[PDB]
DNA sequence: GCAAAAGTGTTACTTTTACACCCATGC
DNA sequence: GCATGGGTGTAAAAGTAACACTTTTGC
């Protein structure tokens, strides 16, 4: 009964869920069909529970909405402005997540009333969610340059143009193809399969995969 | 929403934990407690506390730092929320950790002594309780990155300092030696790092020129790299 | 006079950027 | 036969890293 004299708080959880399609990055967002702030756009969220760690609670939430587990997640931070939720004192912890937009479970998404939304065409979001999104992007952008988290946003196989397209999207500017492909050339953990994609191009481009094993053997990364 | 949207969920203790950096005579140190009270009485740990009803989390951090050091307006960064279940054996506490850069020469000895705290060289840390070492590792990692791309280092130095002090600081932060000539080239280009007419004698035979960080000048164009 | 820290430029090397045309294929 | 994205190399520029000796002055 040492910590007895201190108050206790609601720990919220909020998820910035990145996805990528057709050269553009989107966030999966809720168009709330429940109170508070019903009708308004927000992040997917929840509340830490007694039997779970904060990190798991995040995983839970993410899975309740997307169906996915074993997802790349990063903690964005604790947000504990006093009036950040008008209703009650909630300190929410925020995580971001990179998922593959093809692989999520639509039933669960439909039911939460959530929609993918281009990240530069974003509605106003409730509470301190825009603050959270901003910090999230900042971080993801940073980490994506020095670690291969990008590949979580693409499927297993992909074309150097899809890749380039993505990296162009994350950073918000185009880049020279010949240079880009050269850097990729020397990253051995980005491996050319003997497969080809026919549906993306007339000539059809060679598909590549990310090789976790090879990466860890020599974790150099630059784009 | 309802009373029940919230109250159906449980509530937790929110702890605060401070990694406090200082710099002296070429080496970086943390300010740590030799704990006067339980839990873990007698063991080493970070300075800590609990968020209260009437304060933001950031405020809570600022307060804690002030309680120990007497310092306000300190450079502080949030490291992260630590909320494994059994991180604190006695009870469920989710702890938000922050780091702080301060002038090891300008703090309140009387408060430090009241909390039984001591400066410890960062490469010679004792075993810290609970998940504090995890917290310290992350703090160091972040602070090192941040300091390569923003001028936070100057909070660890006094107002006037020599370019060898500054070099020493950076050699400490990155934990590796660097070239004097190259290092001073970089600093030449930072116009917000200003040479004063003042001179230090305490530190050397010849005596080196004292420099200054001009923040106003920095925020005019925030370019920084060394 | 020598120990001990201050101060000062040039050159090789590495990295980054700019840039334009042919290829294979499906329609 | 043409329209579409796939694929390729080279040179100039910028940036980074390696490198030694002279200056001051307190002891």
From TrEMBL, chain B:
Key words of the record: Hydrolase
InterPro entries the record matches: NUDIX_hydrolase-like_dom_sf, NUDIX_hydrolase_dom, WH-like_DNA-bd_sf, WH_DNA-bd_sf, WHD_NrtR
Required cofactor names: Mg(2+)
GO molecular function, one term: hydrolase activity
Gene3D superfamilies membership: Nucleoside Triphosphate Pyrophosphohydrolase, Winged helix-like DNA-binding domain superfamily/Winged helix DNA-binding domain
PROSITE patterns: NUDIX (PS51462)
Entry superkingdom: Bacteria
Positions annotated to bind alpha-L-arabinopyanose: 6, 17, 35, 87-88, 132
Protein name: NUDIX family hydrolase
């Amino acid at each position: 009964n040492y910590y007895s004299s201190n108050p206790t708080f609601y720990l919220g959880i909020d998820c910035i869920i990145f996805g990528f399609n057709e050269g553009e990055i989107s966030l999966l967002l809720l168009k709330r069909n429940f109170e508070p702030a019903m009708g308004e756009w927000s992040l997917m969220g929840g509340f830490v529970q007694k039997d779970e760690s904060v990190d798991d609670a995040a995983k839970r939430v993410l899975a309740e909405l997307t169906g996915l587990e074993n997802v790349y997640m990063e903690q964005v931070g604790a947000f504990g402005a006093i009036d950040r939720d008008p209703g009650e004192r909630v300190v929410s912890i925020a995580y971001y997540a990179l998922i593959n937009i093809n692989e999520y479970d639509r039933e669960l998404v439909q039911k939460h009333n959530a929609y993918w939304v281009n990240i530069n065409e974003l509605p106003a979001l409730i509470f301190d969610h825009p603050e959270m999104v901003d910090k999230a992007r900042e971080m993801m952008k940073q980490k994506a340059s020095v670690e291969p988290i990008g590949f979580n946003l693409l499927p297993k196989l992909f074309t150097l143009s899809q890749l380039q397209s993505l990296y162009e999207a994350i950073y918000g500017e185009p880049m020279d193809k010949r240079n880009f492909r050269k850097r990729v050339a020397e990253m051995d953990f980005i491996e050319k399969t003997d497969k080809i994609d026919k549906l993306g191009s007339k000539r059809g481009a060679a598909l590549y995969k990310f090789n976790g094993k090879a990466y860890r053997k020599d974790p150099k990364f630059k784009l």
